[PDB]
Design a protein around this ligand. Structure first.
Ligand SMILES: [Mg+2]
Ligand SMILES: [Mg+2]
Ligand SMILES: [Mg+2]
Ligand SMILES: [Mg+2]
Ligand SMILES: [Mg+2]
Ligand SMILES: [Mg+2]
Ligand SMILES: [Mg+2]
Ligand SMILES: [Mg+2]
Ligand SMILES: [Mg+2]
Ligand SMILES: [Mg+2]
Ligand SMILES: [Mg+2]
Ligand SMILES: [Mg+2]
Ligand SMILES: [Mg+2]
Ligand SMILES: [Mg+2]
Ligand SMILES: [Mg+2]
Ligand SMILES: [Mg+2]
Lengths: 49, 49, 106
RNA sequence: AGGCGGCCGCCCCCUCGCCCGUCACGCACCGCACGUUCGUGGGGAACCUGGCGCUAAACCAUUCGUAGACGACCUGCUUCUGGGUCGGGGUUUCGUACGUAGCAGAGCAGCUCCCUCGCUGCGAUCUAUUGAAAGUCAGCCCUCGACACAAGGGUUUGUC
RNA sequence: GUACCCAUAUCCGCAGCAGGUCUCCAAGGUGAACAGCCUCUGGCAUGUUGGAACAAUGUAGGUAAGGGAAGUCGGCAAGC
């Protein structure tokens, strides 16, 4: 990760971003759920219990 | 790996402004760099030595 | 220099991935010989007709996914090979595959 | 693109370390060339002696995939936070497994205590068991659960 | 005269050559069918080589969002 050897503004650098939502769905295939607790609360009980 | 970010865009004068934009975003794991060596360079008329 | 005997569950479905239809069952037995040579250590591997039936029971391309095997090691006599020990791989059937692991059989 | 030079205090000593004058000799090899030099010249293989020390690394084999036509490249190997094979979970893909029971089921046939949905038999499907069963890294993740393995081999490589 | 081959190995083609050569017998299922596919009686080792990997290019086969011949001398090929 190399620092940029030229400094430019261009209304492209130094903008205060606002992060809202970062998905962590199942990338091994098609993701259907966000978190493990949300997946368990949606699906309910299974044969594991 | 790679993820999304639902990001608010504070860039005026566009259709993008005041709206949520989802972008392709990578993740790079960066462990802290442990320092070992010091290398000095002399400026030669063929380059650096 | 032992006479030991151990059971295994070789997974041919994850030891074969990307082998053609007319070679998927013959490459499985080379994989079983390589697995026996890696586990027991002797190059001499003899598999049985029962294991031949258990592999070739479903054609060349529909290889059964997992096979319970039993590897016994024995000595050899009567003008033997330079490899004095040989692994006699025999087949033992089992209905299910879950919660089955390696068992040292007396 | 550096290694010789300068200062201080001593050391085994030298006052002929140089020019001017006297003395006597050293090969005077009797006419002959390549002679006198920065040379204790450059590097290579060995011989005997003094002191100070040094006690390895590549390549093959094997494994690995972030790489591959073959070579080549990035990797693991300890007996304790080492690696490998199964197993267990997590994720996912398809879509509800065999068996069992039904007062679900187009209906049909048979029996008699003559039967107030009577029973039995055949019967595509359906329901509950069932988001079930099945595969899941071989190029997905975690596992200190069970087994065995581990310094086990071959080739080559030195600077007055 | 009476053996044997009568053939993707006993014939011809320089050869154990995807070439050519005249005949009788012909089962079960699906199926109109001696069509195509799977079996039985009967034969065979994949057709003068095996092992490892699945790179380019190739030879055969199948797909592909939206447009549908706009490519090309021509709907050539492929597909309905
Ligand atoms: Mg089924
Ligand atoms: Mg005859
Ligand atoms: Mg011919
Ligand atoms: Mg012919
Ligand atoms: Mg010819
Ligand atoms: Mg017929
Ligand atoms: Mg018919
Ligand atoms: Mg052959
Ligand atoms: Mg032939
Ligand atoms: Mg298309
Ligand atoms: Mg389309
Ligand atoms: Mg049209
Ligand atoms: Mg037109
Ligand atoms: Mg034209
Ligand atoms: Mg045409
Ligand atoms: Mg089509």
């Amino acid at each position: 990760l190399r620092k940029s050897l030229l400094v430019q503004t261009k209304r492209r650098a130094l903008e205060k971003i606002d992060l809202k939502f970062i998905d962590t769905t199942s990338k091994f295939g098609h993701g259907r759920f966000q978190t493990m607790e949300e997946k368990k609360a949606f699906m309910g009980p299974l044969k594991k219990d | 790996g790679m993820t999304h970010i639902v990001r608010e865009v504070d860039r005026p004068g566009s259709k993008v402004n005041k709206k949520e934009v989802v972008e392709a975003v990578t993740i790079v794991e960066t462990p802290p760099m442990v320092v070992v060596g010091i290398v000095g360079y002399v400026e030669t008329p063929r380059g650096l030595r | 220099n032992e006479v030991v005997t151990r059971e295994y569950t070789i997974n041919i479905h994850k030891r074969i991935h990307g082998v053609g239809f007319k070679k998927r069952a013959p490459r499985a037995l080379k994989e079983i010989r390589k697995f026996a040579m890696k586990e027991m250590g002797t190059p001499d591997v003899r598999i049985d007709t029962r294991l031949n039936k258990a592999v070739w029971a479903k054609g060349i391309r529909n290889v059964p996914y997992r096979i319970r095997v039993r590897l016994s090691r024995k000595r050899n006599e009567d003008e033997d090979s330079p490899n004095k020990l040989y692994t006699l791989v025999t087949y033992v059937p089992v209905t299910t595959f879950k919660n089955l692991q390696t068992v040292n059989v007396d």
